[PDB]
């Protein structure tokens, strides 16, 4: 309907992003907004439906938003770019990229929800990015909804003073309207689709409902008190002109004060509503256009330094087959043009802009011209990095913009191609996925070099696997990471062996007396090291010596308990009686057999890899975290009571951190972090060694 839209100036353009908890209504709210703007013609649902937003097959089948959707639309004299963020704990990279690219946030809460710790963590991210936010209390039609309880929870456990701007009529399936505070009006909705195509304005029922009047005027007085206590200039105005009036003015200076407290990072305007019942979306859009920042309302140091150049920030990438390498960016300074050479700051190289357009997330429109403060999609940028600056003419120690930091992925899996012939396809798909999502690290394991995936969570790994299966066509298999054990001997043991092989010509005889003992310089030589001591015999060992080294190395590569490498032993050759004409290969075979027998009859011991676990949690969750660490055999090294946090530093084996991120998040309700780094190899006590051996052998 209204697909053709006109670009506007800075004061009439806004860019914002929607954040909330999982299943809080971001996609539904965006769909309702598009339906009211006219771009969307038919009203659908996420269950059945799933219109322009969440266009992927995985997002349609799982009922969740995986990747952020960028949309552009027009309100009454306002052109606004919206970003529907995923809102999961495993897509915090996407959330942070969409917060960093542009300012302005809409934090959606559920009335009968509480804190919804994902909302808390996205709130912390937005606070770190220093962007204004507006609170939208959705799901007002759901049973058990409580606007007052939600506001109290926001005040208490979010640590931010809210500014109530709307009062709902009902809570439990009787929320049929809202009452505005700044305008002193009531908005009603009586229909199924679009709820009358508009909102019905009958201000406070024309001086007829005393209870509604008293509640509305008390709410207005409270809002005026809050804004006056927050802002100083508005406090001065209230002091000077409208003190005893308590009715300052309808919508000019009160709205100015609320805009100032929105932009001053000291207040969030709270508006109730319900997207599914098509209620409050138009008031939400009005408040978005009246309060949320324009691109230049915040004094950008980058723009202040340079505005005549073409500084822009490429923040997202896409690898669609037909389009090619697509780049989502934000234009900061100047007006950008297609088919013009552009320069990168990180890659100090020139790129040709094949074409440029505006994202509506389902089709290409090929917008010819775009100005500053706009989200744009560019085609043909093959050489692109996740965080980089793009300029023109190279005006200027470098014009580099701090982009997106890798969130240090914590969950580990191993990917399995179905065949060696299909392995190149898997590697190409993994490279494409790595260049798309920088939080999905792929590494090669040092020992038993399988290809491993490092992601943010089990859901992230599962959806990456599904995307690989669907988009590239590979039936791959996931598996737990393998633990590289080591082996050692506990007591010195002797061994003898004799080798004869009469093949005809070249008769030979080897007789080896050797003994293997534990070494003492394990800390001196933490790497896999061996001591090689030959006794005083035979007077000359060069080829025999080389055969000795080769054979004993081959014997040590394989262990007699778990097939694991052996380390930290001393092998001493007591006798090496050879016959004239022996081959060095047969000598090495004899010595390998003798050493294998010695290590077999040696009271062997197995060693596990040990690393540093650094866990950051709260205080009410420290006890379960410590209990789980002790269950998984973590020796606590230190505990530090940080400011409103607790950091535990301990030593935990590799074999006992299988899927630790999921368990930690379950125990801490998602509010916990941990870091790992391998330090040394420790020796198991006999109890754990026997337990591991029994597990590996089955039940016996």
């Amino acid at each position: 309907s209204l697909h053709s839209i006109i670009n506007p100036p800075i004061a009439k353009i806004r860019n914002i992003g929607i954040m909330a908890h999982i299943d809080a209504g971001k996609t539904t709210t965006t769909e309702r907004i598009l339906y009211y703007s006219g771009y969307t013609r038919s009203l659908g649902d996420v269950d059945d439906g799933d219109t322009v937003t969440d266009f992927m097959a995985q997002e349609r089948e799982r009922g969740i938003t995986i990747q952020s959707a960028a949309v552009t639309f027009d309100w009454k004299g306002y052109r606004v770019n919206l970003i529907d963020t995923p809102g999961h704990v495993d897509f915090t990279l996407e959330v942070e990229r969409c917060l960093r690219v542009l300012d302005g946030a809409v934090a959606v809460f559920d009335a009968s929800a509480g804190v919804e710790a994902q909302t808390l963590t996205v709130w912390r991210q937005a606070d770190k990015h220093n962007i204004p936010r507006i609170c939208f209390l959705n799901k007002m039609d759901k049973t058990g909804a409580s606007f007052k309880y939600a506001v109290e929870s926001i005040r208490e456990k979010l640590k931010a003073k809210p500014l109530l701007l709307q009062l709902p009529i009902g809570e439990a399936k009787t929320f049929k309207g809202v009452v505005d505070v700044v305008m002193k009006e009531k908005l009603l909705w009586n229909c199924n689709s679009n709820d009358g195509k508009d909102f019905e304005r009958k201000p406070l029922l024309e001086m007829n409902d005393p209870e509604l009047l008293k509640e509305t005027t008390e709410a207005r007085n409270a809002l005026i008190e809050q804004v006056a206590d927050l802002d100083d200039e508005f406090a001065d105005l209230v002091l000077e002109e409208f003190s005893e009036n308590f009715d300052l003015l309808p919508a000019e200076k009160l709205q100015t004060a609320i805009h100032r407290v929105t932009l001053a990072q000291t207040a969030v305007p709270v508006l109730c509503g319900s997207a599914l019942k098509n209620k409050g979306i138009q008031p939400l859009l009005d408040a978005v256009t009246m309060y949320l920042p324009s691109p230049e309302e915040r004094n950008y140091e980058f723009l202040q330094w340079y505005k005549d150049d073409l500084c822009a920030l490429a923040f997202k990438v896409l690898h669609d087959k037909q389009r090619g390498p697509l780049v989502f960016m934000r234009i900061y300074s100047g007006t950008i043009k297609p088919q013009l050479a552009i320069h990168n700051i990180n890659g100090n190289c020139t790129e040709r802009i094949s074409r440029l357009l505006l994202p509506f997330a389902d089709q290409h429109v090929e917008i010819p011209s775009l100005t500053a403060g706009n989200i744009a999609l560019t085609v043909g940028l093959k050489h692109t990095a996740t965080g980089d600056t793009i300029v023109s003419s190279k005006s200027s120690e470098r014009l580099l913009l701090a982009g997106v930091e890798i969130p240090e992925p914590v969950f580990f899996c191993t990917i399995e191609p179905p065949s060696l012939s299909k392995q190149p396809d898997l590697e190409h798909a993994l490279k494409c996925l790595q260049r798309e999502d920088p939080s999905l690290k792929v590494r090669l394991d040092p020992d038993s070099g399988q290809t491993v995936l490092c992601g943010m969570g089990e859901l992230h790994i599962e959806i990456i696997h599904d995307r690989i299966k669907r988009e590239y066509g590979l039936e791959t298999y996931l598996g737990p990471l393998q633990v590289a054990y080591r082996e050692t001997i506990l007591n010195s043991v002797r061994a003898t062996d004799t080798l004869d092989r009469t093949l005809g010509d070249k008769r030979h005889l080897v007789t080896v007396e050797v003994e293997a003992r534990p070494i003492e310089t394990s800390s001196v030589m933490p790497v896999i090291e061996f001591e090689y001591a030959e006794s005083i015999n035979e007077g000359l060992l060069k080829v025999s010596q080389e055969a000795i080294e080769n054979g004993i190395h081959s014997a040590c590569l394989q262990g007699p308990l778990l097939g694991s490498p052996i380390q930290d032993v001393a092998i001493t050759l007591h006798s090496l009686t050879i016959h004239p004409g022996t081959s060095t290969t047969m000598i090495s075979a004899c010595v390998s057999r003798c050493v294998q027998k010695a290590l077999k009859k040696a009271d062997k011991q197995v060693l596990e890899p040990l690393m540093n676990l650094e866990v950051t949690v709260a205080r009410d969750y420290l006890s379960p975290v410590l209990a789980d660490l002790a269950q998984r055999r973590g020796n606590i090294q230190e505990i530090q009571t940080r400011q409103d946090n607790k950091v535990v530093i301990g030593f935990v084996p590799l074999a006992e951190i299988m899927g630790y991120s999921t368990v930690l998040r379950t125990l801490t309700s998602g509010s916990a972090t941990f870091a790992l780094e391998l330090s040394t190899y420790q020796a198991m006590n006999p109890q754990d060694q026997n337990t591991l051996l029994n597990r590996r052998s089955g039940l016996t």
Partner: protein
């Protein structure tokens, strides 16, 4: 709001753990507490430990009450030893005279416990004697002319032998 006890140094009142986080959780500022402690104990020798009581009131107001140092520190300073004995009774770390015990009792009588419990100095002397017994410090009636140094030399050689034995045991355990 609650009762808080803390072993704090005379002037080394750092705003860090394990004292800063507790007061921050309570609600009062830690910088003000450190400044008040330093200004109140600026005339006390820095380095010695002392117990103190912190009272926190609603509106986040704090007050400080400071008592006499620990009897452990008093007796260790009197005996001239840096650390106590491990095997109490079987080995002796130092010697403290009943005269030193009486001096310690007199200087510590002006604490909250023995002030609220108005008792003669005999009870305090007996308590100091029991504390010395726990410390492993023998309490001879009147013997300090040079035998104190004579015992100090043999105590030093015994401590060196114990350190050597501990190092040998640690090495044997590491190699085991």
């Amino acid at each position: 709001s609650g009762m808080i006890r803390a072993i704090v140094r005379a002037g080394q009142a750092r705003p860090g753990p394990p004292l800063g986080p507790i007061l921050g959780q309570r609600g009062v500022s830690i910088n003000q507490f450190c400044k008040e402690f330093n200004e109140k104990t600026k005339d006390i020798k820095e380095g010695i430990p002392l117990p103190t009581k912190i009272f926190v009131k609603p509106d986040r107001t704090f007050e400080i009450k400071i008592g006499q140092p620990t009897v452990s520190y008093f007796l260790k300073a009197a005996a001239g030893i840096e650390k106590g004995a491990r095997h109490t009774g079987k080995e002796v770390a130092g010697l403290v005279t009943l005269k030193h015990v009486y001096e310690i009792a007199r200087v510590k009588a002006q604490d909250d416990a023995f002030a609220l419990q108005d008792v003669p100095l005999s009870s305090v002397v007996r308590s100091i004697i029991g504390s010395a017994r726990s410390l492993g410090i023998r309490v001879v009636k009147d013997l300090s002319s040079e035998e104190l140094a004579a015992f100090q030399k043999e105590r030093a050689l015994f401590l060196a032998a114990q350190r050597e034995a501990d190092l040998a045991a640690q090495a044997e355990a590491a190699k085991k």
